[PDB]
Design a protein around this motif. Structure first.
Motif, short mmCIF file in Angstrom:
data_model
loop_
_atom_site.label_atom_id
_atom_site.label_comp_id
_atom_site.label_asym_id
_atom_site.label_seq_id
_atom_site.Cartn_x
_atom_site.Cartn_y
_atom_site.Cartn_z
N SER A 41 0.83 -1.19 0.00
CA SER A 41 0.00 0.00 0.00
C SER A 41 0.87 1.25 0.00
CB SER A 41 -0.98 0.00 1.14
OG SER A 41 -1.74 1.19 1.15
N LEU A 42 1.81 1.34 0.96
CA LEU A 42 2.67 2.50 1.14
C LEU A 42 3.39 2.86 -0.16
CD1 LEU A 42 4.28 2.26 4.71
CD2 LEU A 42 2.72 3.99 3.81
N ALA A 45 1.41 4.19 -2.89
CA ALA A 45 0.83 5.48 -2.55
C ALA A 45 1.84 6.60 -2.75
CB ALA A 45 0.25 5.47 -1.16
N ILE A 48 1.89 7.27 -6.69
CA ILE A 48 0.72 8.02 -7.12
C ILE A 48 0.84 9.47 -6.64
CG2 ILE A 48 -1.81 8.22 -6.89
CD1 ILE A 48 -1.87 5.10 -6.82
N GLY A 49 1.56 9.67 -5.53
CA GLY A 49 1.76 10.97 -4.91
C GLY A 49 2.72 11.86 -5.70
#
Lengths: 56, 49
Positions: A41-42, A45, A48-49
């Motif tokens: 997940s991290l 993320a 995408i950030g």
């Protein structure tokens, strides 16, 4: 098959400890598969950030 | 005329139980074979995700 008066209860107890201890190993396994969920997940993320900054 | 071998067989009967080998060995497995199906299921479900 005749036995003494306490042997049948030693044999039932030696398989209560085993099921309890084999029960804990399961709990801990499931926890460690939850770490690899947080980790994935991290990572995705953070990717995408960065995209949102650069395209701006 | 103490029946030496009737007192013995009366001490035994009062300090002995009865146990079926293949019944204390079927329960044990029965309980340890339910926790091993949840350990496998877990592993299998991680390699499918």
């Amino acid at each position: 098959m005749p036995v003494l008066l306490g042997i049948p209860l030693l044999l039932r107890f030696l398989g209560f400890l085993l099921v309890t201890l084999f029960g804990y190993l399961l709990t801990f396994l499931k926890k460690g598969f939850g770490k690899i969920a947080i980790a994935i997940s991290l990572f995705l993320a953070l990717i995408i950030g960065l995209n949102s900054i650069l395209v701006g | 005329d103490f029946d030496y071998e009737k007192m013995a067989n009366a001490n035994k009967g009062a300090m002995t139980e009865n146990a079926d080998e293949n019944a204390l060995q079927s329960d044990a497995k029965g309980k340890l074979d339910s926790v091993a199906t949840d350990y496998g299921a877990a592993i299998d479900g991680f390699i499918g995700d």
